[PDB]
Amino acid sequence: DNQLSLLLKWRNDKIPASETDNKCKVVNVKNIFKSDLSKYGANLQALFINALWKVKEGLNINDLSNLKIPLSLMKNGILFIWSEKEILGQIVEIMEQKGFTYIENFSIMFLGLNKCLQSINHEKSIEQVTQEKKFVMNNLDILKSTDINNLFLRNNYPYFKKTRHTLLMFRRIGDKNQKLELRHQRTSDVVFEVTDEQDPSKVDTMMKEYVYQMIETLLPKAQFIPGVDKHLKMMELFASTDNYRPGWISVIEK
Amino acid sequence: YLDRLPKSKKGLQGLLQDIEKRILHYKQLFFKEQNEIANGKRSMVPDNSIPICSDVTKLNFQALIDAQMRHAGKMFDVIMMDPPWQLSSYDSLSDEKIQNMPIQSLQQDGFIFVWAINAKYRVTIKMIENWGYKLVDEITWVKKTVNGKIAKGHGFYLQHAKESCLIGVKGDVDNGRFKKNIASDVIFSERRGQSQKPEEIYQYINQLCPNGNYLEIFARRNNLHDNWVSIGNEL
Amino acid sequence: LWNYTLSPGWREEEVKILKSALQLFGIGKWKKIMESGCLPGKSIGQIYMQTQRLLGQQSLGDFMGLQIDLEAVFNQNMKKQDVLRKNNCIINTGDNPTKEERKRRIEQNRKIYEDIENEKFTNLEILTHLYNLKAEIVRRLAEQ
Amino acid sequence: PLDFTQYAKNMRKDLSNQDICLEDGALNHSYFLTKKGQYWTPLNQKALQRGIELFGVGNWKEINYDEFSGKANIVELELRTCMILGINDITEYYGKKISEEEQEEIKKSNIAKGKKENKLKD
Ligand SMILES: Nc1ncnc2c1ncn2[C@@H]1O[C@H](CSCC[C@H](N)C(=O)O)[C@@H](O)[C@H]1O
């Protein structure tokens, strides 16, 4: 009916922490949009920042302009940043003056988990946002008789109803006769998952994990197991306080 | 190789007879159709559709705004355009050519919508912030297949499977006739003809700024609706 | 039976036109075949598969750029009929070899050897094709 | 202006092309239903009437030469010169000039031959 089985096909592939070693590097500085990052890695490929903009708020947009990215930090590489609808704009123009070029975008469309459970019937706890998503996942073909557009989010927004989140992804080419290795078409620009209405901007695990898996697939060469190399060719900012993903040079702001 | 039969003599002429009566059949049907149209028959385009068919560069928007002031007194409220973008494997649609057109003259109080592909997403932002418009929101349309799958769009860096549209604001958008948080900014509908667009976005706009003149740009015969002053080379 | 296996819905006259065009131009020069225009309504892919059937070997990598006799290759493929010739086509044992190996294979193989009434069109253009179709038929009867 | 219909008519008169909307007319659905490139304004039909006045039905092959209609097409023009005569075949008017119609009255009496859709079968 809805063909929703194919919509969440990759969500059925779950695949959900390396200690400080040759495979994982850890940095915990109280400053990040000011701390030099070229000393934490050079000629890297994947560079992720988990910028939780929100209009409470986690990070101020105007702060981002003071961060410096040097060519010595990375010649050929990519930055990944989050976008929030109430703070949409004023974020799409900051990064170009730091020396990147726009290539593509990625986005997450939230299908209103409360509406999904309502259609299955015919504030949420951590359990209600972790196991309830499995609950609506395993019976994914019972609500396929309904309309897709019904179960979308209805969140307060000045102009429309806010429904989706967004990953801006920016590649810089900086060295002539040098390129990057990419898998390219791995995960569709359209993806599908539900998200709690309490923090639609926030993305919990099994979805953050989905992004982690897709980025690990897009840039496999950036990773390095402890035996092959000790220095990691891909770093991260603003991760969880307990997750230290292998390959990533984690930089958590305390 | 000749498509027709090489030699059949009168054996084919009999078939000719068949064909020729078929011929008369078509024209007699045509006559009926003629009687059906020259009697007062109403076509699909509804009332209050104003299809200005002219080149956007050739057209003088000054006459348009003069008519706007003369008849209504309020200038435009909601505007849209999905111009032919650049693909790099007409050529006067250079994004700069799209820019220099004085849409800022055509609008002082109201929104805007601009659909564009992600390959020209960024240039769209500079397209909208250049004027008094401020990019505030986006409406996105997810392609659908016949069954309910996701279209396997060509992938440059990721598998392209959605289409984006930007929204802007100049002057005052709280003109009373505007409505806020009308509904979701996403549209899930099938993949129609080449670069076609969902007709439910016009329902969205009717929810948005009803009882007022509109302006879509670069239309086709599909686009025309009620209360839509519309422009388009193929319109 | 079923010699030179036929694609669904193509005349054998088209097959012999293709044979003549391949004998004059050569395998792989499908663009020249389109330029000549002796096979209307044919695509490069479909003519490629038809060449696969006519040569008797499914893989055309060993026959690229060859003005070889199609029937001779088909006959020598029956000379090696010990291999399963599915659809009268031999599957090449070489798995997509390098350009050098494919090139030496090329060298060795060289050395060895109604219509408009359809389309759901409106009355205007169908009659446009119909009247001069009838003129063509009238001229055909006149010369008969 | 909340007078949406009058407003629309005014804008159509002020901006829209003549072949799109009449001088003070409605949307003119006839142009909409036909495709862009071939439409029959009163100018085109009066020009074809002039062409009929030129020689009438017969060996009159200058139908496209005069370009009386906008980008005249021989088959479409010969098709659209037939409803005026009201008879499917024109063999009974071959080789003569025709001034007015005087053909609908002499043929609508033929009930068996045909009177529906303002036309007669053969
Ligand atoms: N400069 C131009 N060159 C060619 N066609 C143009 C054109 N400007 C407008 N058009 C016409 O309008 C289309 C561009 S717009 C296409 C989408 C349409 N506006 C919609 O919303 O449904 C073209 O395909 C053509 O039909």
Spatial gap, N to C terminus of chain A: 48 Å
Main sheet: strand order of chain A: 1-8-7-2-3-5-4-6
- Note the overall shape of chain D: globular
| Annotation, overall tally of beta strands of chain D | 0
Which sequence of SSEs, written as H and E, runs from N to C of chain A? HEEEEHHEEHEE
Radius of gyration of chain D, in angstroms, nearest whole number: 18 Å
Q: Give the helix tally of chain D.
A: 5
Binding site for S-adenosyl-L-methionine 2 (chain B): 55-56, 197, 220, 222-223, 233-234
Binding site for S-adenosyl-L-homocysteine 3 (chain B): 55, 195, 233-234
Binding site for S-adenosyl-L-methionine 3 (chain B): 55-56, 234
GO molecular function (chain B): mRNA m(6)A methyltransferase activity
Give the helix/strand layout:
The complex is a heterotetramer of chains A (254), B (235), C (144) and D (122).
Chain A: H1 4-7, E1 25-27, E2 46-49, E3 77-83, E4 101-110, H2 113-121, H3 126-138, E5 164-172, E6 192-193, H4 208-218, E7 234-237, E8 248-251
Parallel strand pairs in A: 1-8, 2-3, 2-7, 4-6, 7-8
Antiparallel strand pairs in A: 3-5, 4-5
Chain C: H1 12-24, H2 30-36, H3 44-55, H4 70-79, H5 99-112, H6 123-143
Chain D: H1 4-15, H2 29-33, H3 42-55, H4 74-80, H5 104-108
The structure holds S-adenosyl-L-homocysteine (SAH).
Structure description:
The complex is a heterotetramer of chains A (254), B (235), C (144) and D (122). Chain A contains four helices and eight strands, in the order H-E-E-E-E-H-H-E-E-H-E-E. Chain A has 254 residues and is α/β, with parallel strands linked by helices. In chain A, strands 1-8-7-2-3-5-4-6 form an eight-stranded mixed beta sheet, with no helix packed on it. Chain A is globular, with a radius of gyration of 19 Å. Chain B is an alpha/beta fold. A six-stranded mixed beta sheet of chain B has the order 6-4-5-3-2-7, with helices on both faces. The longest helix of chain B is centred in the N-terminal third of the chain and has 28 residues, at 10-37. The relative contact order of chain B is 0.17. Chain C is mainly alpha-helical. Helices cover 53% and strands 0% of the residues of chain C. Chain C is built from six helices and no strands. The longest helix of chain C has 21 residues, at 123-143. Chain C is elongated. With 122 residues, chain D is an all-alpha fold. Chain D is globular and about 55 Å long. Chain C binds chain D through residues 123-124, 127-128, 131, and chain D through 38, 73, 75-76, 79. Residues 82, 84, 90, 93, 195-197, 218-220, 222-223, 232-234 of chain B line the site of S-adenosyl-L-homocysteine (SAH). The PDB classes it as transferase. The entry lists the keywords 6mA methyltransferase, transferase. The assembly is tetrameric. The entry is titled "Cryo-EM structure of AMT1-AMT7-AMTP1-AMTP2 complex". Chain A: AMT7.
